[PDB]
Design a protein around this ligand. Structure first.
Ligand SMILES: O=C([O-])/C=C(\CC(=O)[O-])C(=O)[O-]
Ligand code: F3S
Length: 862
């Protein structure tokens, strides 16, 4: 092990980074070395054992804990460690396989006092808390002091409180920092390897930042130079953390600006982040990771400024002058506790341990922790979302500003956050899921897998199914297209993807840390956000699509003055709030998804849309058959699938839907009149908020077109097909087509549409995210494209590419003529397909497809 291991150390040091943690195989070999240590290797072997092994239920941890338990029990011996030392080290693995040996040690007069100190600061006790109470009740004195210790919150009070004065050096990034900037798509493969992945942070050049190697390595040396001023760094920007939920963005920042975690290799916590505006998902990820995120005016903060931050006072001052630079308020006072605990998650878990111990010993109620603020007189009614969250909490409704913990009915996970989520789950010592349903897809890496992705394909499914989750297969297609067909109406959920925007019920997307917690405990912490109401009125004009309406939201918000495009001092009524939509209650559920999905680009924390029962009834009747069919096909964890089917059947039998009260409170109400939308609306190159009417950008030359995000359904493809079929010959553009699911692909194939795409010269990609994410295939450098995908951030679909977001029907026209069409032209082409609109926009209903029902009829409920 040793020789190969330090060759690795050297390879990595040459590149300036830490070595990867030991794996199970290496840990096993290490065990042998500890039993018979070669001369002169004592200190190395001890460091590897102590600092270079993942904690929790990682496979290497299993091996490490087993070895140590044996040492502590005399069952094994090493000249380098004593039983006392083994117990001490066991107390450093935070949870999982180290707890049993630690509890057993309480029955040993020698080790007990040490085991007790270790358990006293162990948070991940979960059900093991009872094992400890039982020993105390049987007369164990050391068990008693552990209980009292938990009861007194020693684990919390022994941690340094948040200082009153923080002196930090400003690392300032002007404009908007989205998570792609911090953690680029093409580098998604290295996310689980924190130190390596961090090298890509801000690798693309932008104002005031100097990448050590443009397009490959970020401003590591610029960062290092700033660290020499003697103060810790703070990340500072006008708009921070918009876009993708990838925790890797946070991991990277903290790797450079955070603090080490004792005995946990290659992962950092803490830190400070300041932005004019901070996207809600990013904010959560930062607080869960132990950082302190603060929304404040940053115009007076400059690259390299040394600064004094006073959390309790809410002031930022120049360090040399004492001048006031800005003032602020923490979003909640509980943040102070979160930082002290090392993050919101550890806080919740630890606080619950103390509470549990306080009730066992018959004590009052802790006064050590800050409580969430109280909400005033509960006179008025509730909005749809407030009722949904309320019901998930056993109450009629939850008010904005309140802290709550909704039950998680559905949890989604995809393959680019999956590996991180899996790691976070290991850190939380999770061996089984408590959420009602956890589904894992393989949509982001299936088309052009790297070797590491292949390992992901062969390993993540089991990790998920063994915990009771449902797993799809590479080639099945996009997460949301499947996940949405597994949802229960009016319920609450989350997912490791920013586009987890349930078209029925409500979801609050999150980073891998919180997704792990929600999967494991079946619950999610939530500071209830405010809502913004968007109301559609009237009838759609000719040739207008649902997608145009999605884009009209930012458009009208800009007209009314609730949204601005300029990044400095950006205004955005939607940021951090729940977007609630009404006015289109008869939309098919997948149509509803187009609107709810796009709430992500609004920077909304979540979304609801009011729908009638019929379209949901149709959807569920179709989904029941799909799920039975999945069982017949052999899919991941049958029991979970079966229970979900029953849940759907129960609802169909008594179809009830929640509804907003007429007197609900909203932060703002936006009315949009469909009669005023006469021409298609696009999102102009590189900003999802920059909505413009077709007439404003008509004539722009187009190189490449992309059709097929989770924003599309089979109807969009039929539409594009009919348009292409009408104008035979090869296209002047490069057209990419990517059906969201294999069910979609198969039906289009059966209907003859692949011949149509084939003759046109189009590329048909396998079911999955394809170009939408930009992590595998990419558009040509500097190309101008029109895309039905969700995000046109700089460098996403391609390097230096300019991307217009539009509807599928408009995109098909553009692909045909090589440029954005004029409103008149657009209407001429589409008029043609409207004649057969009934045939074109037929949705997939699995209960009407024999190949599906036949397999469903063959299933016996276990
Ligand atoms: O990178 C990821 O796997 C997270 C995503 C995908 C993306 O950025 O489209 C998200 O939260 O949306
Ligand atoms: S990345 Fe995939 S999940 Fe949807 S938003 Fe794009 S197709």
């Amino acid at each position: 092990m040793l020789e190969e291991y330090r060759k690795h150390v050297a390879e990595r040091a040459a590149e300036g980074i830490a070595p990867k943690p030991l794996d199970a195989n290496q840990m096993a070999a290490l065990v042998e070395l500890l039993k018979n240590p070669p001369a002169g290797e004592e200190e190395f072997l001890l460091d590897l054992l102590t600092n270079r092994v993942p904690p929790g239920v990682d496979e290497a941890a299993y091996v490490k804990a087993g070895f140590l338990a044996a040492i502590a029990k005399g069952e094994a011996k090493s000249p380098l460690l004593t039983p006392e030392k083994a117990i001490e080290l066991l107390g450093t693995m935070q949870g999982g396989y180290n707890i049993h040996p630690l509890i057993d040690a309480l029955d040993d007069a020698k080790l007990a006092p040490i085991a007790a100190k270790a358990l006293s600061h162990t948070l991940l006790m979960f059900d093991n808390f009872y094992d400890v109470e039982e020993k105390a009740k049987a007369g164990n004195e050391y068990a008693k002091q552990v209980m009292q210790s938990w009861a007194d919150a020693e684990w919390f009070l022994n941690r340094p409180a948040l200082a009153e004065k923080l002196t930090v050096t400003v690392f300032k990034v002007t404009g908007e920092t989205n998570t792609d900037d911090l953690s680029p798509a093409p580098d998604a493969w290295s996310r689980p390897d924190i130190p390596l992945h961090a090298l890509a942070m801000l690798k693309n050049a932008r104002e005031g930042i100097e990448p050590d190697q443009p397009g490959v390595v970020g401003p590591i040396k610029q960062i290092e130079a700033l660290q020499q001023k003697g103060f810790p760094l703070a990340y500072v920007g006008d708009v921070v953390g918009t876009g993708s939920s990838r925790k890797s963005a946070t991991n990277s920042v903290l790797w450079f600006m955070g603090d080490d975690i004792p005995h946990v290799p290659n992962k950092r916590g803490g830190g400070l982040c300041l932005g004019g505006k901070i996207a809600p998902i990013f904010f959560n990820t930062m607080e869960d990771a132990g950082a302190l995120p603060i929304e404040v005016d940053v115009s007076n903060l400059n690259m390299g400024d040394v600064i004094d931050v006073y959390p309790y006072k809410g002031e930022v001052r120049n360090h040399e002058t004492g001048e006031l630079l800005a003032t602020f308020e923490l979003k909640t006072d509980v943040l102070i506790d979160e930082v002290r605990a090392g993050g919101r998650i550890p806080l919740i878990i630890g606080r619950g341990l103390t509470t549990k111990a306080r009730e066992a010993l018959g004590l009052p109620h802790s006064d050590v922790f800050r409580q969430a603020k109280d909400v005033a007189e509960s006179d008025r009614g509730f909005s749809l979302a407030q009722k949904m969250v309320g019901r998930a909490c056993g109450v009629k409704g939850i008010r904005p500003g309140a802290y709550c913990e909704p039950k998680m009915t559905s949890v989604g996970s995809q393959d680019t956050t999956g590996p991180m989520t899996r790691d976070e789950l290991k850190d939380l010592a999770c061996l089984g899921f408590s959420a009602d349903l956890v589904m894992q897809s393989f949509c982001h890496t299936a088309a052009y897998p790297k070797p590491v992705d292949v390992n992901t394909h062969h390993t993540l499914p089991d990790f998920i199914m063994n915990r009771g989750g449902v797993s799809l297969r590479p080639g099945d297609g996009v997460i949301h297209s499947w996940l949405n067909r597994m949802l229960l109406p009016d319920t609450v959920g989350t997912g490791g993807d920013s586009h987890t925007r349930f078209p029925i019920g409500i979801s609050f997307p999150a980073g891998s840390g919180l997704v792990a917690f929600a999967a494991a405990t079946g619950v999610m912490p939530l500071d209830m956000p405010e809502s913004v109401l968007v109301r559609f009125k009237g009838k759609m004009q000719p040739g207008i699509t649902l997608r145009d309406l999605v884009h009209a939201i930012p458009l009208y918000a800009i007209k009314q003055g609730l949204l601005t495009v300029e990044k400095k001092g950006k205004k955005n009524i939607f940021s951090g709030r729940i977007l609630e939509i009404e006015g289109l209650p008869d939309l098919k559920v997948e149509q509803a998804f187009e609107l709810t999905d796009a709430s992500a680009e609004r920077s909304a924390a979540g979304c609801t849309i009011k729908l009638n029962k019929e379209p949901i009834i149709e959807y569920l009747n179709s989904n029941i058959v799909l799920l039975k069919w999945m069982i017949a096909e052999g899919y991941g964890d049958r029991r979970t699938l079966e229970r979900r089917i029953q849940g759907m059947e129960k609802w169909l039998a008594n179809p009830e839907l929640l509804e907003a009260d007429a007197d609900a409170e909203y932060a703002a109400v936006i009315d949009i009149d469909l009669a005023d939308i006469k021409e298609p609306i696009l999102c102009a190159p590189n900003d999802p908020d920059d909505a413009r009417p077709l007439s404003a950008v008509q004539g722009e030359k187009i190189d490449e077109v992309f059709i097929g995000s989770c924003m599309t359904n089979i109807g969009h493809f039929r539409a594009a097909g009919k348009l292409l079929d009408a104008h035979k010959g090869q296209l002047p553009t490069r057209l990419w087509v990517a059906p969201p699911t294999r069910m979609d692909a198969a039906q289009l194939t059966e209907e003859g549409y692949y011949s149509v795409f084939g003759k046109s010269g189009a590329r048909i990609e396998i079911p999955g995210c394809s170009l939408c994410m930009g992590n595998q295939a990419r558009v040509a450098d500097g190309a101008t494209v029109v895309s039905t995908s969700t995000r046109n951030f700089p460098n996403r679909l391609g390097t230096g590419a300019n991307v217009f977001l539009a509807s599928a029907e408009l995109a098909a026209v553009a692909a045909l003529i090589g440029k954005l069409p004029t409103p008149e032209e657009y209407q001429t082409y589409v008029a043609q397909v409207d004649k057969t609109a009934v045939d074109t926009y037929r949705y997939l209903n699995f209960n009407q497809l024999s190949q599906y029902t036949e397999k469903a009829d063959g299933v016996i409920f276990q």
